Design a protein around this ligand. Structure first.
Ligand code: NA
Ligand code: NA
Lengths: 106, 106
């Protein structure tokens, strides 16, 4: 938990598959595990992790039905965690978990 | 617009009719129109208007399907405006409009 850092993914405004406008944010739980890769492979591993979290969130939710936002939160969180983890690995970072927090309907 | 005061209705956590948890807030647009009633009929006409806005919001949304939150926002706003206006009248206040702002799904 000590080296497990909390990242607040800035809010993402997109539309679901079934044409529903959603404002979504999330917390990323990530650990620095290869210092040499974190410091060599990218300029800034925090904001590198932030950027790809925002791009991924936008896409995963764009690719989602509203009913999945209601019923299948856990499944969506696993998709976010899978993808962001794959992304952060070249930078020596493990993503422990991803949790969608708020979901606003404007 | 000068005497039309903006009131931020504090967030209301409830469930829709079709069993959906919702966090909802709104702006109330209200005008003081009978000063004698505003000052006689109640201790504090702002917080009187706030309280009844929160109670009403909770009920109108409890009495709503999620699909009405998506599709029929305007209709829900008219219900809120009708009811809160009726409520504020004994206190010499006209409610110009009510607009649900944010709708969070926890
Ligand atoms: Na990773
Ligand atoms: Na009124």
């Amino acid at each position: 938990d000590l080296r497990t850092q909390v990242l607040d993914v800035p809010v993402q405004e997109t539309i679901t598959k079934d044409n529903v406008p959603v404002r979504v944010n999330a917390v990323v739980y990530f650990r620095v595990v290869d210092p040499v890769k974190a410091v060599t492979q990218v300029k800034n591993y925090i904001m590198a992790t932030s950027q790809i979290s925002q791009t991924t969130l936008r896409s995963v939710i764009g690719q989602a039905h509203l009913d999945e936002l209601l019923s299948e939160r856990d499944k969506l969180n696993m998709q976010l965690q899978r993808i962001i983890d794959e992304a952060t690995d070249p930078w020596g970072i493990k993503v422990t978990a991803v949790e969608i927090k708020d979901v606003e309907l404007p």
